[PDB]
Paper text:
The HEG1 binding domain of [name] features three lysines, namely Lys475, Lys720, and Lys724; based on point mutation studies, these residues are essential for the interaction between HEG1 and [name].14 The HNA was found to form a reversible imine adduct with Lys720, and SAR studies indicated that the HNA is the smallest/simplest 2-hydroxy-arylaldehyde that inhibits the HEG1-[name] PPI. However, the interaction of HNA within the HEG1 binding pocket of [name] induces proximity of the aldehyde moiety with the ε-amino group of Lys720, resulting in the specific targeting of this amino acid residue.
To evaluate the potential of the HNA as a site-directing fragment to identify HEG1-[name] PPI inhibitors with potentially improved binding affinity and inhibition activity, we synthesized and screened a series of HNA derivatives bearing substitutions at the C6 or C7 position of the naphthalene ring. However, compared to the unsubstituted HNA, derivatives 3, 5, and 6 established additional interactions with [name]. Thus, the X-ray and activity data indicate that the binding affinity of the HNA for [name], and the consequent inhibition activity of this fragment in the HEG1–[name] PPI assay, respond to elements of SARs, and in turn highlight the importance of structure complementarity and templating effects in promoting the formation of specific and relatively stable imine adducts with [name] Lys720.
Numbering used by the authors:
A (entry chain A): 419 to 647, 652 to 730
B (entry chain B): 1 to 62, 67 to 167
């Protein structure tokens, strides 16, 4: 029989039988997982290589996307396909309303969402102030390392090797080493406070609660370029989520602009290779050049239309 | 952070997945979904060391030769309610030593479903007796449902790999 590995962001995977070979659909693969109809509604199958991630649809055949990946890369990116082998992932549905996520109680759905959120945080895709990042680091210490012990954690426990797993990689160098005392204090408060539940799925939901207010939470990230007003090229990540549109500098992950639905407008370029954004009251306009502009605008239209 | 490659082997239905999922995710898997091949990752602390565990959850039937070539520690699980699953582990122990070409292989004998004390078919002494023949191999009676002897299955394999 045929089988495929469905990965998650932490490196784990689950093998699923392909009853219909490469004609098997996302819907049929989702049924092959160990997910109830409660756990299943929050997630879907993505196909991602190192520099292109695509959320698939229930009717899509993911193995044919793997087969056609060099042509998909050439249509949506300017990458060379020889360094990009795609894999199939189980990830949060980009259309999942935040209001629906906030009502989730299932421990498995929480851990899957938590693991994806932690992956985005450590990679730097979550832009947030220092206090929010320090709180997230303290929760990761409780989740991963357990209860705080002064014997074990008070001094020289938060080296770069241990700091890397609790803070964004973009802050690990010139910001995180100044955070250790504030991180351990909140870590100690978490453990010594019996008013907060040490249940695993309860701690993971606390982590997500802090992530739900980050502007880029749950965003699908596309790749593009903008030109500076005397013109310089700036590679950017184009993040589209249920809140709106966000631009990150590709090199630094710094948040260039964050726009909520109803405060900006979009228009697809005539050549499909770009889209323009008009902000309200900001009275400014920028254009993002990307071969994914056709997907960015379509996703923007659906996620805007979802909000009532 | 040192990486540890652990492999959970045994016949079907013994609770290989339920033990792994309880350990990694803290959930008790109730439904019986026969495994093809699942892999899990989990960071733990064994003897003041941060360890990255890669736990391979295998099929009750089967690619078995590759699991043993690559795996560093092996949990051999049976159900105390099924005699045949106990009998099957002798071949697994012997085949592991064959692929490794040595008897010094990190290994633990696990009698699962010890919460079903009434449905017990395999006694505790018979399990200890088996681990004795296996060059004084580690032995635990565990329960994925009651969270009894779950973490120390994998902690003990880490310690055996470190020695
Ligand atoms: N009462 C009880 N039931 C258990 C225990 N461990 C597993 N089970 C039950 O036994 C059944 C089979 O468990 P499972 O983990 O799928 O075993 P498996 O070895 O992974 N099967 P396979 O080899 O086909 O993948 C499930 O219904 C599960 O709930 C236990 O400690 N106590
Ligand atoms: C066209 C469409 C609809 O209808 C729903 C969801 C979509 C998601 C994407 C996407 C997510 C990550 C990358 O692309 C694209 C199109 C979608
Ligand atoms: Mg199993």
């Amino acid at each position: 029989y045929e089988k495929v590995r469905i990965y998650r962001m932490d490196g784990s995977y689950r093998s699923v039988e392909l009853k219909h070979g490469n004609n098997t659909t996302v819907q049929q693969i989702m049924e092959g997982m160990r997910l109830s109809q409660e756990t299943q509604q929050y997630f879907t199958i993505w196909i991602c290589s190192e520099n292109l991630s695509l959320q698939l649809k229930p009717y899509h055949k993911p193995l044919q996307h793997v087969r056609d990946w060099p042509e998909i890369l050439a249509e949506l990116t300017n990458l060379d396909p020889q360094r990009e082998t795609p894999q199939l992932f189980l990830r949060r549905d980009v259309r999942l309303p935040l209001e629906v996520e906030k009502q989730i109680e299932d421990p498995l759905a929480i851990l899957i969402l938590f693991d994806e959120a932690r992956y985005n945080l450590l990679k730097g895709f979550y832009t947030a102030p220092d206090a929010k990042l320090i709180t997230l680091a303290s929760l990761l210490l409780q989740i991963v390392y357990g209860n705080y012990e002064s014997k074990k954690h008070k001094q020289g426990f938060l080296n770069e090797e241990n700091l890397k797993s609790i803070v964004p990689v973009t802050k690990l160098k010139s910001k995180a080493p100044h955070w250790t005392n504030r991180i351990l204090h909140e870590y100690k408060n978490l453990s010594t406070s019996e008013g907060v539940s040490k249940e695993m799925h309860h701690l993971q939901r606390m982590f997500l609660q802090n992530c739900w207010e980050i502007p880029t939470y749950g965003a699908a990230f596309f790749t593009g370029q903008i030109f500076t007003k005397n013109h310089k090229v700036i590679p950017v990540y184009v993040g589209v989520n249920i809140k709106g549109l966000h631009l990150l500098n590709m090199e630094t992950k710094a948040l260039l602009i964050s726009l909520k639905y109803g405060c900006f407008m979009w228009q697809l370029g005539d050549t499909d290779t770009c889209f323009q954004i008009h902000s309200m009251e900001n009275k400014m306009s920028f254009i993002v050049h990307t071969k994914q502009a056709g997907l960015v605008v379509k996703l923007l239209m659906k996620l805007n239309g979802q909000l009532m | 952070m040192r990486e540890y490659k652990l492999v959970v082997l045994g016949s079907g239905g013994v609770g290989k997945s339920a033990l792994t999922v309880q350990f990694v995710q803290g959930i008790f898997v109730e439904k019986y979904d026969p495994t093809i091949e699942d892999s899990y990752r989990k960071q733990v602390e064994v003897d003041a060391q941060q360890c990255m565990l890669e736990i391979l959850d295998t099929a009750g039937t089967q690619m078995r030769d590759l699991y043993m070539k690559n795996g560093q520690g092996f949990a051999l699980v049976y159900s105390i309610t099924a005699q045949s699953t106990f009998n099957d582990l002798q071949d697994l122990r012997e085949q592991i030593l064959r692929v490794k070409d040595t008897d010094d292989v990190p290994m633990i004998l696990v009698g699962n479903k010890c919460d079903l004390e009434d449905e017990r078919v395999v006694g505790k002494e018979q399990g200890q007796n088996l681990a004795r023949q296996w060059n004084n191999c580690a032995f635990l009676e565990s329960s994925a449902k009651s969270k009894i002897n779950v973490n120390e299955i994998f902690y003990d394999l880490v310690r055996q790999i470190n020695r």
